[PDB]
Design a protein around this nucleic acid. Sequence first.
RNA 1: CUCUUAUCUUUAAUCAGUGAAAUUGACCUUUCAGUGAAGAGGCUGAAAUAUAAUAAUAAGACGAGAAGACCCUAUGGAGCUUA
RNA 2: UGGUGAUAGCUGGUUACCCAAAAAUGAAUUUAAGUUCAAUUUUAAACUUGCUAAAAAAACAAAAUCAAAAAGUAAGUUUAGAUUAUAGCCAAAAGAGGGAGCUCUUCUGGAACGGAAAAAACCUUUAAUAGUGAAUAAUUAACAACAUUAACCAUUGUAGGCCUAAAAGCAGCCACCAAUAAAGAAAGCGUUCAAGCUCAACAUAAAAUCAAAAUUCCAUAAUUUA
RNA 3: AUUAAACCUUGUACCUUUUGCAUAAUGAACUAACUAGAAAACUUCUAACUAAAAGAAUUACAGCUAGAAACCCCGAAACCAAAC
Lengths: 85, 78, 154, 115
Amino acid sequence: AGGQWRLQQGLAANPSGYGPLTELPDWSFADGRPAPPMKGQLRRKAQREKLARRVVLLTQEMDAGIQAWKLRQQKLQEERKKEHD
Amino acid sequence: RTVSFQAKESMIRRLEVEAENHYWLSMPYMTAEQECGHAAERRAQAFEAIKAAATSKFPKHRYIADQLDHLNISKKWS
Amino acid sequence: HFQRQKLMAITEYIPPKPAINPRCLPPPPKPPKEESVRLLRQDIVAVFRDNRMIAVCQNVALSAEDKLLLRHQLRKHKIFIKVFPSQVLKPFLENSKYRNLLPLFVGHNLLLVSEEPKVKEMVRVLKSVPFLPLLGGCVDDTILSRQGLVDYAK
Amino acid sequence: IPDKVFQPKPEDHEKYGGDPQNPHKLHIVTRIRSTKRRPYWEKDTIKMLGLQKAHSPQIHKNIPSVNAKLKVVKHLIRIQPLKLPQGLPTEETMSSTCLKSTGELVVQWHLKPVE
RNA sequence: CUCUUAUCUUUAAUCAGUGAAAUUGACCUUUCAGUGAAGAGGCUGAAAUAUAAUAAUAAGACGAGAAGACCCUAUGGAGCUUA
RNA sequence: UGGUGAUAGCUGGUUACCCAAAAAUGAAUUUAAGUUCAAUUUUAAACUUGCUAAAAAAACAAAAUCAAAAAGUAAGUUUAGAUUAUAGCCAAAAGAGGGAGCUCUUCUGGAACGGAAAAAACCUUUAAUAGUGAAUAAUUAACAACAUUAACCAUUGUAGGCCUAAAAGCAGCCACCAAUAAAGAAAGCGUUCAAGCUCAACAUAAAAUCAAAAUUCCAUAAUUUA
RNA sequence: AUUAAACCUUGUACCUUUUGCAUAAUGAACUAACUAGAAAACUUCUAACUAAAAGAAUUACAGCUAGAAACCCCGAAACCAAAC
Ligand code: FES
């Protein structure tokens, strides 16, 4: 329940999604020493980083396709303007 | 079987969501010409790895250590 | 299937709601009145103009043919029973020489139209049947009662 | 189905908040239904697109081939345009990226409530 | 038989002695309506319901049953006989 | 008794665990409970494109067949060896017999531990793990009809001509006019025939596009706090 | 599950067989013992030796030798011989 309202506020519909409750460490040493990163958090980080790399690659590939498109239209333009003799 | 009010709303929501899908599919960022060959290099490289992996089958090697290690089963206190 | 039945309901058209129902609407303009009935105006206008004094007596369920005979009977008296439907009688005052005789011409009653001051002839008609309510004659197109008619029929 | 369905109108742009110029580059698609009891062609497309797991985020290009493929499976997916308020992530920030449900991929996560 | 009744013997019931057979998935073994294949003690929905016993009757569930009964067929088999 | 553990394509039974892959087309058969051939699957080897998709062009008539480049993607072709499977069920489409419904042929889908009452075949559902967490999907319930028609009166010609005894508005039969304020040469009634009952006449009322069979009823109830 | 044996909640006996279904149909009083897959011609695999191999008879222009790897049970009506 409440997923619709959470989306309205910009939060994840399920509290178990992206949030401080899930992402943040759940404990720390009494001495104050920071706790080791959670295996799930590290696992989740790897997938998020991998997806980000895919986004960069796809955007870079799309950028090349956009430029290479114009480059192909520059070859036609120069081909049209030709002379001899 | 008279239709419950809840069911009608759910179907309407699905249609409305599908309508949004139509709109976001109505603006192709890249034209047909640009798409051609944009991923050609990647596809060629991927298939080469597939062929190399596919044709890598062979029987496995045999080592002396396997036969010699079996003799260790007789180890005991001195 | 259940899903198919849902589609049928969806096809139902959604109509908007009018602000006010026609009965409870504020008084709107209405089509202009038209005089259809127009012919009857000339007939009553001519006879009333011709005859100054119009003796009046509520018809006692008299038959149409009797009026034809009574028309001829008054022709002996030099008077005419020229009467017409009363639905177009009320608009007579609207388009005629006078406009104030509407209350006098309330109900459907015999109209005895006479142009000549032959008092004896008019009374003799009254002598035929007195029991029917005789309102009186508008001597000189003036409102008169039954007793007033006698007071001014002279 | 007539092509007019996929021809947008000015009112449609306002409703969905999509600019006819500078169209969004990447589609966000998640499977929300099962392919069981569906014809083989529908099943094949879902497997090809990689949407085997429901509610699984996928990054795809807004290109005609992808657009044609997405149209076939339109009813089983939700399409959202990706947004980059801070631009593309850098190599150093690749580990700090986070995608929000609103469709915005932040390149820096500061662990502070938006409030 | 109208029109049944009475008595006696056997059986019956009680005490004591001796003591089988068919049968048997397990059963803490209900009623109504539904559902189903003609079909429900065991499912669905209602209802009823101290525990344990004791004594009686055979109408129905178009009761359960067999290789019972009758007639006819086969470009079915097989066996037998030939002129 | 022996041959004899006769034979039986038939009936019945046929004893530990775990991992992987996995049944239902065409041709012939005393063949349809089986077997052979193609096809599949499968093992090994050779080495490279395959599947979805696919513009335009034809072909047909005036979304599949064919398949440039792509794109999404990872299998595919050939050679050698080899079997097993080759009988559904129901739902839903398209046809053909037909006229109900059925009888078929073709395409599509299914095998909950959720839901539709119980519910192999319908709907929501990617596998299965512990936890006294969380967001969601399908989900047997649903909320009488009217926008010309309500009061009053009914005279005279001609009982008009027609075989009708007679038929006068009103048995048949006619054409189809007048006076009148208003009378139909008659609209339903009555009819020995007519007298006669009203409707229309005139006057005077007042209005304005469909809904929500025989044992014993069978949850109980319930119209308004966002 | 539970403080609590019973109450509340959930759940249509088993094998075989029918359609991958039984509210069909077969079989079962229970206990103990007994009660049903058996063969190497060729292949793959493991090794010996190699234009050779095998302790005689076999095969061979990489073959040849050895080893391992396999295919149930009970039950008719009958038919025949010899005695009684
Ligand atoms: S509220 Fe009824 S007529 Fe206005």
